[PDB]
Write a protein that binds this ligand. Sequence first.
Ligand code: LBV
Ligand code: LBV
Ligand code: CL
Ligand code: CL
Lengths: 321, 321
Amino acid sequence: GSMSRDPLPFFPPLYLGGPEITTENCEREPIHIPGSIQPHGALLTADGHSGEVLQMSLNAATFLGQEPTVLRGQTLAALLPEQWPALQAALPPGCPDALQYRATLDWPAAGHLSLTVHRVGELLILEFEPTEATGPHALRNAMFALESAPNLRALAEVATQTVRELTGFDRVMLYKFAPDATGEVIAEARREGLHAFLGHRFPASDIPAQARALYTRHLLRLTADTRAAAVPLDPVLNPQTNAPTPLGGAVLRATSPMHMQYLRNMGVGSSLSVSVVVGGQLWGLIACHHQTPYVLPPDLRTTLESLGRLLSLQVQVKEAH
Amino acid sequence: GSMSRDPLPFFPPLYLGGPEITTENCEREPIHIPGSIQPHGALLTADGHSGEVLQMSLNAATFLGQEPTVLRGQTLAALLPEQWPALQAALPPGCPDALQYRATLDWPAAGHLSLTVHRVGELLILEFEPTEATGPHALRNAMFALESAPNLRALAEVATQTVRELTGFDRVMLYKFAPDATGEVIAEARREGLHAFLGHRFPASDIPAQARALYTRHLLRLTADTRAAAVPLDPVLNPQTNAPTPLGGAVLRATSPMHMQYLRNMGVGSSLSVSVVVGGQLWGLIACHHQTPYVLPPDLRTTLESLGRLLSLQVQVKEAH
Ligand SMILES: C=CC1=C(C)/C(=C/C2=[NH+]C(=C\c3[nH]c(/C=C4\NC(=O)[C@@H](C)\C4=C/C)c(C)c3CCC(=O)O)/C(CCC(=O)O)=C2C)NC1=O
Ligand SMILES: C=CC1=C(C)/C(=C/C2=[NH+]C(=C\c3[nH]c(/C=C4\NC(=O)[C@@H](C)\C4=C/C)c(C)c3CCC(=O)O)/C(CCC(=O)O)=C2C)NC1=O
Ligand SMILES: [Cl-]
Ligand SMILES: [Cl-]
């Protein structure tokens, strides 16, 4: 009912005995601490000073080639001797939780592993994703058509078409929030034949207050496969704190099951969105759908994040005119 | 004497019998058509429809492994069968002259060749640069400190420090133009011990009107080695037009000898700048120096171009506040 209102406090998650989430209580789902990840990658956590590996996703062996039990308790100084110093330097204590370190690692299988790391408090969160063998050059050519737009609607149209051209997604929308937190599709690029959502409005409840809050802090999130089961972290609690591990800054964070059902009800196989944040407030989303499961590659997600940040400034300039 | 005044018409270049350039006539130097390039890369031009190679820099054999005479008149369809279709698709007739196609080619020597192409009228201009084996990820982490700046001066300071950290340049300045076209160093990041230019002002003549005009169209230029002799194009005129080839959109464009002397007088071995363009007007430059010759890698130059575009929007937002 309002973009400026605080979200409600969260319930405990399910693995700490919290309540099942229904349409009556879903604003209280603790979406940032699901204790699990999407299965197209693996996640480890590690102490930010010692590098000791503290938690691992149960599927870690598939991606890393070693079982969860042997890797646990080993240090990153030993495991990643080539990356550990760089990672430390990049993510010092107290850095922003949205700051990332990225590297590409070689692995027995085809392509590489992409490694993305961020810091929350005293914890480092490491995401591993298979990638095949996008420059900053993409973003460069894409800024030109955005800078040439004559007004806010024209900017919206070209930004959505640009994102579609870059990603190949079946649908790319610009969804703009109103002050009552309802939202509206103001531009859409879509594959020929797909039903249009352009000009449609949706209730505030479709993107609940705690999601909107999270999306003001961590600007990109996705569901690669709307039918894929989440993979638990083990142990599920961070041993540093004996409390849940915040996963808001990890793209591999498991998506709310309530939203997964919403996406399936729409016939969506894969979803991704990027926040448009203007003057520190959530202005809208670049919201993308695919008809089938799709893993957008790491570097492309970063181009889209940067683009999201470009678009926010372009909007802020134009709204001031 | 004014940022809004038109530049004077240019003299013919030296190779068409134009006058020698002195401090009395230097606003008329045709800097965009020097008929030559910097020697750290090679350049070819080609017909935009047929792909026939029309001009080549005299050093082309060093980079391409084949002498200028045999490659001339061959088509890109034959020479670059893997890139020619993509290049065509990327740079259609009538596209912006600042739009670029980039690819990496393998060559007998160490590393690769970077290929950058743009279109001017019916001509494609191909630049080849050796590069060793930067993600969009650089630009991403760099936007954070810029978005956090509390005012225009703070933004200037962090942007210059960011560019220095990304590039390793000995000096990075933000130079801001006044309405009379004089300019002023408003932020500076520099190696310990180097003499400060912070807060210094310079006459309009140091960046003459035709340079300022060019820099409003083509947002990055450089001199990799301030003592290096230029390499002619052959033939020097575009056969399509029997007229000079515009090189404003090619980083390999030879720098004005007058500016090269200026840089040497400052003890500068390498220079690079990026335009900051606000509301279509040249607001300032991110101006970089190195004490010794330096070739900033292609992808890093693009990150800096994008950053330049980021900074311009951030300035435009703040000036509106
Ligand atoms: C064409 C119109 C259109 C709309 C309006 C739309 C909405 C949308 N919801 C999103 C997220 C969430 N929604 C809910 C919860 C509820 N949603 C409901 O309807 C009720 C039943 C409910 C609870 C009672 C939760 C917990 C999240 C957080 C998920 C997470 O990050 O873990 C996102 C962002 C993520 C993404 O891009 O995929 C989008 C873009 N997507 C469209 O295509
Ligand atoms: C610390 C202060 C400081 C200043 C003020 C500064 C100036 C500067 N001049 C630039 C360019 C040019 N200047 C001139 C000509 C003349 N210059 C003069 O003084 C008189 C003698 C003269 C003619 C009579 C021409 C033709 C060009 C175009 C070159 C080209 O693109 O081919 C550039 C951009 C290029 C770059 O980043 O390296 C910069 C940043 N660079 C600094 O570091
Ligand atoms: Cl979080
Ligand atoms: Cl030109």
